[PDB]
Assembly symmetry: C2
Homo-oligomer: 259 residues x 2
């Protein structure tokens, strides 16, 4: 399916690692869809070159450039830089439908059945569950929607200073409309919810299709012991999946660029 | 509307205070429905007498008694005592439809529009938002459903040792079925979500219809300064509403029993 893609975003090298693990995880679970990554010029050439191998398409977005449609909004709302860059996922009109996934998510199972969903489908955010979590969503590229989102970003900004606020504001019927636009939580399982509601994780977590690494420490911020195959200093299994992919597939990939 | 009620539960004197504040809060916001409270014999006579004034119906449930239908299940699963007592809300067949509200909830606005909903309607639980939070739900009394719930309690218990696990297990299509059975989060606003996702609270919290006091410290565990009209040692406004009702309406009510 060439006109459908998973789309992610990396604005730096640290998140490129996440994006590389994510992309690898999607390939590992045999997606039949394209993989696209939005990148900024702040992503270094070696990460970019690795991204070009993992992803079918690497799209460079430079909202710091005057030529960018989001640039004026950036000047108005400089804290929305990441948001405005992410919003360019809607510019990818070479695709009819996409699943956006933040670079700090990890695919545990094939999730191509997401492409049955309509814009805007997303899992509930823990914390304020009448908002959707913007880490994973099904959307449809459209210059119009992009422009409309830009306009809301310009006019109202984001109630949380992030892309999630903006997206919830724009796609505001999510909470009260169409249960099919509630992605099951297992398609965007907040790593924090392992703690916040442990019995529920015990009951339903084995079904996790996507893990979303939230909180202060991102997976790449951990130390991974390659001998014991575990991160150190915590329910580590998801981190360990992330690190195994990173160790097995991503590092060896980045290593071949030194030659 | 005589065949519809808000129903709560108190198993002790501390929660009776909550139940009294809840009942008062419902009267304050002019419910046209009946108010029913399930009570246990562990609730003292003075609390019971106060409950008889606030609530239209005080129902005594004694699952420790052999004569109780839930009693055998209690012996099997003694940790489910509170759950099994709460499940008796389904025994209240004098009502055609009820909103169950835990005694640690607080009504901030008329919520009689809940009676438009069907069993089982409930707000998402923060933490694991594909579970509903069992603090507030619309249900329909039925001996059959009661029996079915008892049976699931007996057979499977609760994945979280509480009523929420059991109810989610029984009413398991909630996450994926019928958006109208997702009560808006503002009908069961987790006091913890004030912290967990503060920008969202800032954005949507002013619309709170029901506050659900979760976490270690219940409202009655705080110290309330009646002069400054605030609790001490925190976004205190909801606690302060709880305490104002408690101070204005509940304490004076309990005071008239000493004569
Ligand atoms: Cl629906």
């Amino acid at each position: 399916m060439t006109d459908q893609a998973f789309v992610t975003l990396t604005t730096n090298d640290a998140y490129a690692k996440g994006a590389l693990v994510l992309g690898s995880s999607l390939k590992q679970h045999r997606t039949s869809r394209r993989l696209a990554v939005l990148t900024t010029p702040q992503v270094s050439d070696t990460m970019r070159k690795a991204l070009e191998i993992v992803f079918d398409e690497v799209i460079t977005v430079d909202i710091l450039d005057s030529g960018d449609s989001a640039h004026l909004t950036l000047m108005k709302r400089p804290e929305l830089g990441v948001t405005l860059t992410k919003l360019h996922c809607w510019s990818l009109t070479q695709y009819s439908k996409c699943v956006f996934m933040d670079a700090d998510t990890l695919v545990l199972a094939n999730i191509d059945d997401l492409f049955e969903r309509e814009e805007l489908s997303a899992a509930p955010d823990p914390g304020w569950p009448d908002c959707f979590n913007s880490g994973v969503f099904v959307y449809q590229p459209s210059v119009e929607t992009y422009n409309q989102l830009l306009h809301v970003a310009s006019e109202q900004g984001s109630f949380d200073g992030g892309d999630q606020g903006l997206l919830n504001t724009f796609f505001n019927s999510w909470a009260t409309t169409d249960i099919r636009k509630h992605l099951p939580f297992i398609y965007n399982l907040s790593s924090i919810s392992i703690f916040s509601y442990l019995p529920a994780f015990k009951a339903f977590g084995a079904n996790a299709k996507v893990v979303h690494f939230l909180g202060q420490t991102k997976p790449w911020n951990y130390t991974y012991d390659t001998k014991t195959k575990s991160v150190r200093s915590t329910h580590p299994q998801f981190l360990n999946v992330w690190w195994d992919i990173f160790t097995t597939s991503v590092v060896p990939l980045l290593q071949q660029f030194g030659l």
